[PDB]
Structure formats: structure tokens, C-alpha cells
């Protein structure tokens, strides 16, 4: 059904990219409604602490309003795959930005933030090196964030989920690892590069007209010397960035895509399990 706090992208479930945001607190949505592209920038506030889903059964996850909303908002149906892979029998390799990329003929490749089919790329007259399937590096292939793995049909209405929380302890011992357990019910999401985390800057300088975004404290000390008359602003939370700064963090984000390894099911017990 219709969800109230479901500021919704126009191209939701229209065979187009989406960037649905899961921001903590309804206040952080304050900019989002004003800084969306109105096409693919869906959002859903969530205030509180999401319950651990690793000991509580599938049929009762619809009971929780926050948990039910995410499935309703994303169109996910519990117990079934979120996508459907299209089979293939070809493999190719190419160099992109000085890095070797392993791709398949039915995969999607992202260039300059835009995803292009491999069939269209091969018509652009740039070098593809065909390799045998037995020589394909599965570990390297599954760790590429510029490659999308042969999606045929999808039940998703929202293509991607962009988790975005704070940096302080309201972000550390909080929502951030909790939804990853909830999203672990579809392991295909993380390998597909769909569950994403937006990196909120921690320290921002005030040099001249523009500003410099320092995502870690380590990046600050190493670059403090080369900062002419820098002013420091500790962003210990989402509700500390001005409207213009939040707009830049949305239109030109730095994404922390989470990829689940073969060890994935063990760690969810070591924390929160």
C-alpha cells in the first residue's frame, strides 16, 4: 500500500536506475525533499534502532512497521531472489582507467557514472580481449563495482538502496550494521552492488570560495599542511551540513558499496547476532 514517509522517485519501477535513500531521522529528510532530482532519488526516514533480523523468522518481519515498509517500499518479497540472472557464454577483458576489468557479454559496465551494455560498448571500437570461462578470475570479477552481473528481469521497483547515516556513535552502534543484516536476506544484492552507503564528510575546510571534504580524520592531518587558512567543522552527524553541502553530497556522492564475502554469515553472529 501507500507509505506516508515515502518521498518517492518519479521513475520508481520503470526499468530505470534508482537511488533510494535510508536516512536516519525525519529531520535529515529535510534537505532530501528539496535536493532530489525528482527522477531517481527516493527516500525513507527511519528513526530508532532497527531490530536484529537474524533470530526472528521471515513471516514475522512483516509485523515490524519499519521492516515492513522497507520491503513495501523496495517491492522486495521475502524468501525469493531480488533479481533474475540472464545466462551467458562469453567472457572479455579490457583496461579502464589503468585497471584491468573482467566483464561478460551480458553484463553492464559503468563509465563516468553511466551504465552501458557490453554489446553497445563492443560497437564503440575499443579493445575487448576474449578469454575462456575457466580462466576468469571469479574473486576479481565479483569485486568489481563498475560491472553489473547480467540482470534479465527484476521485481524491484527501486533499483538501488543508498544507506546514509551519521558518523558519531548514533551511526556506529546504530542502524548501519542492523539493516545490512536485514538486507542479508538477499545476498545477491551486495554482489550486484545495490546496497550502498553514502560517505558523509567528517571534517570540512573553508578555504577561499569552495570547500574541501575530508571523509576521514586520517585524510585531514595528511592534508592539513596544504590547506591555506582552513576552518574546521566537525560533522558528527547528518544534521550538521548546510543545504548546499547536502545537495553536493547527493548529486555527486562518494558511495561505500558493501560486498558480502563467503565469510558473510559468520560475522552477523559475532556482532548483533
Amino acid at each position: 500500500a501507500k507509505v506516508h514517509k515515502h518521498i518517492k522517485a518519479n521513475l520508481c519501477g520503470k526499468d530505470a536506475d534508482t537511488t533510494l535513500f535510508l536516512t536516519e531521522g525525519d529531520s535529515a529528510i529535510g534537505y532530501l525533499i528539496d535536493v532530489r532530482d525528482k527522477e531517481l532519488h527516493g527516500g525513507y526516514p527511519l528513526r530508532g534502532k532497527v531490530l536484529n533480523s537474524w533470530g526472528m523468522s521471515y513471516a514475522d518481519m512483516l509485523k515490524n512497521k519499519e521492516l515492513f515498509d522497507i520491503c513495501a517500499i523496495t517491492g522486495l518479497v521475502l524468501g525469493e531472489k531480488a533479481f533474475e540472472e540472464k545466462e551467458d557464454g562469453e567472457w572479455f577483458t579490457f583496461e579502464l582507467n589503468g585497471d584491468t576489468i573482467i566483464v561478460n557479454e551480458n553484463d553492464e559496465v559503468q563509465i563516468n557514472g553511466k551504465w552501458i551494455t557490453v554489446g553497445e560498448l563492443r560497437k564503440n571500437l575499443m579493445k575487448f580481449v576474449k578469454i575462456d570461462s575457466s580462466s576468469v578470475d571469479m574473486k576479481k570479477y565479483k569485486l568489481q563495482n563498475n560491472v553489473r552481473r547480467s540482470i534479465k528481469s527484476s521485481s524491484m521497483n527501486y533499483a538501488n538502496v543508498a544507506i546514509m547515516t551519521d558518523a558519531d556513535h548514533d551511526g556506529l552502534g546504530s542502524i548501519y550494521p542492523s539493516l545490512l543484516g536485514f538486507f542479508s536476506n538477499w545476498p545477491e544484492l551486495f554482489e550486484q552492488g545495490r546496497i550502498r552507503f553514502v560517505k558523509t564528510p567528517v571534517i570540512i575546510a573553508q578555504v577561499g570560495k569552495k570547500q574541501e571534504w575530508f571523509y576521514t580524520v586520517a585524510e585531514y592531518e595528511s592534508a592539513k599542511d596544504a590547506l591555506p587558512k582552513h576552518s574546521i567543522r566537525y560533522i558528527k552527524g547528518l544534521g550538521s551540513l548546510e543545504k548546499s553541502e547536502y545537495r553536493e553530497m547527493i548529486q555527486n556522492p562518494v558511495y561505500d558499496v558493501v560486498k558480502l564475502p563467503e565469510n558473510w554469515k559468520e560475522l552477523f553472529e559475532m556482532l548483533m547476532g
Binding site: K2, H4, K5, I7, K8, N10, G25, D26, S27, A28, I29, G30, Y31, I33, D34, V35, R36, K38, D166, D170, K236, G237, L238, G239, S240, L241, E242
Partner: protein
């Protein structure tokens, strides 16, 4: 063992008259002169306190709300947190007195972020309007460090708009535009027929009309097609959550419309598609009236101007004109206090400066031989002079570089300039000094 005979009559009586005193101090009604609720005044005083060192330094709202207890506030930091958030944001205030950094909300979502993430400071609006702070009356309770009320140039209570509910009284003042309020006060200063200030909500692109004493808050709408409509502005009291849930949700449930969300940086906005079930009359006026009714695009608000005057007594004003006419009357004597006080300071400053300039003229040529003496002897040898006597401590306690030629001339000019300044304050009245000060606000 002084056994008293106080009886039970005063026990119940003194149980009251202090709960009322506990309530008379926390009355939600805004003071007429400054426009501050008691919770609002302490935040401003705390924000001013933190800004003494660096005026443009932003302080965490938790620090601002956490310091009001030291100033005298009783209701904790939770109440002072909301007042700080509602001051800084420009969506709620036409004339924001606090310049805020962080998530203070918007028209779409009126919830501010957590007070420990957002920052606040006293804005440039405050210093342009809230003058003569040193002459503000001292609070009757000595614990209340903030004064009884600040002394703004214009009646701020009419600018940001105030709403509140108290026991037996309610206050609701529509936010009036800053430009018109300044014009109204200037006319009241000269005693002319004061025009009714125009009500203008902050960040409002709609239409406001005054009908039969009621202010009808009208939103604006434009049609994109025969069955497609695009709302461009909506009444003030709706946010995106209340508008969609209370208005757009049931009509979508009723099946009349299939609305589309178009809210963006340019305020509100809603693209609405009309179904066949909904009936649209061919008359333009009838469609205009029907649309503004079901969609809740028209709102009627009635002002209830209850404010606390300069004497601490609750007062009810029929219209904003009477408040402004009374406000300038109270503000006039405080300007007269400035005129009287500036005369004393300038006169005192001139004599100190004129005597200070005369140390040089005596020293440089031949007169006062500081060159070898006892410090106590030096003071006595010049305290005999009547002009030098009154400021002997300052006049000797002076820098060496005052004895050079260029600084000697600068001292003489400064003493001469003070006489012109002292004469300027002597031959000026409230009208001149309240119109000159009523020319820097914007």
C-alpha cells in the same frame, strides 16, 4: 524556639501566589517590547553571552540550551532547545534573530535536527535591531540574569509571528513583513496616520488577503492540462507530512485524484491528475472555488494580539496599529535614556580627553618636568590644578608614545572631536535619533 501562629489559611495561600509566580514567569505570551517568550529570552541571552569573544562563531545548540539553567531558566534544556531551533530557521521566521548552521528544517519538513548536531549564533539581524541592550530594565528577580526585556528598534513580536496557549489566555500574531513594520513605526514616530502592516509569511509564494477582519491565506495553483493540475504553493500551516496525510491521502483513497509529488527547492509543489470520477464545472470561478475547498488551499486565520506590556501586565490589543502606537511610546523614553546617558559619557570623555591632550602641550614645550621625580610627588604637583585633578590616575597612567608629535595632534583632534560629539548629543531629540537608527535595518 519561636513558635509562630501562621494557620492553614496562608499555607494554602502561599502554596498559591508562587505556583502563579511559577506561571507568571513562564507565560507563553510574548512580551510586547522585545517579542520574546521567557524560554526565548534566555536562549538569546545565552547566545549573546557566548558571542562576546567571537561574534561570528557558531555554538552547538546543546551548549546554548544547556546554559539557560545558569542564567535562571527553570524548565530545563528541552524547552530551550525548541526555542533555539525555531529562531534560526528562515521558514518559521520573517526576521530570524539567530543565524543557524545545520538542519533547522524547512517548509516541507518542519522538524529540526538533533540539537547536538546543529549550530546557532546571534544573527546580523539582531545587532541591527536590538540596540540599547545596556539600558534594558533589570529583572525583578535577581536570579534572572537576562533583563526583563530587550529594546529592539521595531516591534519584533510582529515580525516572526508568535503563537501560544496559556491558562485563560491565548496569543496568535501573524508574521508581518519587516519592510512594512519599519514604515509603520516611522509614521508612528512622526505621529502620522499609521498604515496597517502587511502580513507576509516567510518563504511564502502564495496570496494573503484581508477579508472582513480575517486573513485568508490563499495558495496558488496553475493548470497544466484539462485533467492535470500543478499546485505551486499551499497554505502556511501545512508541511509535506500533514498536507499529504490529511488532504491528499483521503482524496486518493476516495479515488478522485492520483497525485504526484513535485516538492523541491522552490517551496512546495504537487502535480495532481484528475480522474473521471471527479467532476469539474465548466465555470472558471466554480472550479476555482471548488478546488481551493477540497484541497484545503484556502485558510482563514484570526489574530488574537495578547502581549505583555512594559509593566508586566497582560494586555489585549484590538489591532496591530494600537500595539505599534503604544510600542513607539515606550521605546521613546528608552531612547531618551540613551540621549541622557550619552550626554554624561561624552561630557566625561571630553574632559578626560581634553585634559589628556593638555599633558602633551605642557610636557613637550617646557611645563611638566616628569624627567626625574617621585611618582607620588608627580601626582600631587598636578592634582593641584583643577582641570588635571579629576582624572589624575588616567592622565598620568598614559603611554609613552603619546609624547610624540603625530600622536600629540591625534590626541588634540580626538578631544576636539568629542566636543562635537558631545554637542551633537546635546542638541538632538528622540525623533532625530530614532529615525537615524531606523535606517540601518534591512
Amino acid at each position: 524556639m519561636q513558635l509562630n501562629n501562621r494557620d492553614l489559611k496562608s499555607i494554602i495561600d502561599n502554596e498559591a501566589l508562587a505556583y502563579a509566580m511559577y506561571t507568571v514567569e513562564n507565560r507563553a505570551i510574548p512580551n510586547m517590547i522585545d517579542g520574546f517568550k521567557p524560554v526565548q529570552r534566555f536562549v538569546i541571552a545565552r547566545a549573546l553571552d557566548l558571542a562576546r569573544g567571537n561574534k561570528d562563531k557558531f555554538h552547538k545548540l546543546a551548549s546554548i540550551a544547556g546554559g539557560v539553567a545558569d542564567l535562571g531558566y527553570h524548565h530545563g534544556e528541552n524547552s530551550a532547545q525548541d526555542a533555539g531551533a525555531l529562531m534560526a530557521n528562515t521558514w518559521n521566521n520573517n526576521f530570524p534573530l539567530l543565524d543557524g548552521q545545520g538542519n533547522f528544517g524547512s517548509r516541507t519538513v518542519q522538524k529540526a535536527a538533533a540539537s547536538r548536531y546543529i549550530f546557532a549564533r546571534v544573527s546580523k539581524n539582531f545587532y541591527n535591531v536590538y540596540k540599547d541592550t545596556e539600558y534594558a530594565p533589570v529583572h525583578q528577580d535577581k536570579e534572572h540574569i537576562p533583563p526583563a526585556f530587550y529594546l529592539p528598534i521595531i516591534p519584533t513580536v510582529l515580525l516572526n509571528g508568535v503563537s501560544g496557549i496559556a491558562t485563560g489566555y491565548a496569543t496568535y500574531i501573524l508574521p508581518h513583513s519587516v519592510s512594512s513594520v519599519k514604515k509603520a513605526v516611522l509614521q508612528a514616530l512622526q505621529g502620522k496616520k499609521v498604515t496597517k502592516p502587511k502580513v507576509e509569511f516567510p518563504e511564502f509564494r502564495g496570496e494573503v488577503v484581508e477579508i472582513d477582519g480575517q486573513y485568508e491565506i490563499r495558495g496558488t495553483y496553475k493548470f497544466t492540462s484539462r485533467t492535470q493540475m500543478h499546485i505551486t504553493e499551499i497554505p502556511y500551516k501545512y508541511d509535506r507530512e500533514t498536507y499529504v496525510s490529511k488532504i491528499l491521502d483521503p482524496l486518493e483513497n476516495k479515488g478522485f485524484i492520483t497525485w504526484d509529488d513535485a516538492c523541491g527547492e522552490h517551496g512546495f509543489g504537487f502535480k495532481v491528475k484528475f480522474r473521471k470520477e471527479y467532476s469539474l464545472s465548466d465555470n472558471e470561478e466554480e472550479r476555482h472555488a471548488k478546488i481551493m475547498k477540497d484541497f484545503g488551499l484556502i485558510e482563514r486565520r484570526s489574530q488574537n494580539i495578547t502581549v505583555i506590556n512594559e509593566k508586566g501586565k497582560l494586555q489585549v490589543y484590538d489591532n496591530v496599529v494600537d500595539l505599534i502606537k503604544d510600542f513607539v511610546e515606550v521605546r521613546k523614553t528608552y531612547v531618551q535614556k540613551r540621549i541622557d546617558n550619552k550626554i554624561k559619557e561624552t561630557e566625561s570623555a571630553f574632559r578626560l580627553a581634553f585634559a589628556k591632550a593638555h599633558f602633551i602641550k605642557k610636557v613637550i614645550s617646557g611645563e611638566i618636568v616628569v624627567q626625574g621625580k617621585t611618582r607620588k610627588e608627580l601626582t600631587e604637583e598636578l592634582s593641584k590644578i583643577d582641570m588635571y585633578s579629576s582624572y589624575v590616575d588616567k592622565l598620568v597612567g598614559m603611554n609613552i608614545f603619546h609624547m610624540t608629535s603625530d600622536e600629540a595632534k591625534k590626541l588634540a583632534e580626538e578631544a576636539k572631536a568629542k566636543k562635537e560629539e558631545n554637542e551633537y548629543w546635546k542638541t538632538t531629540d528622540v525623533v532625530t535619533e530614532y529615525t537615524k537608527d531606523l535606517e540601518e535595518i534591512k
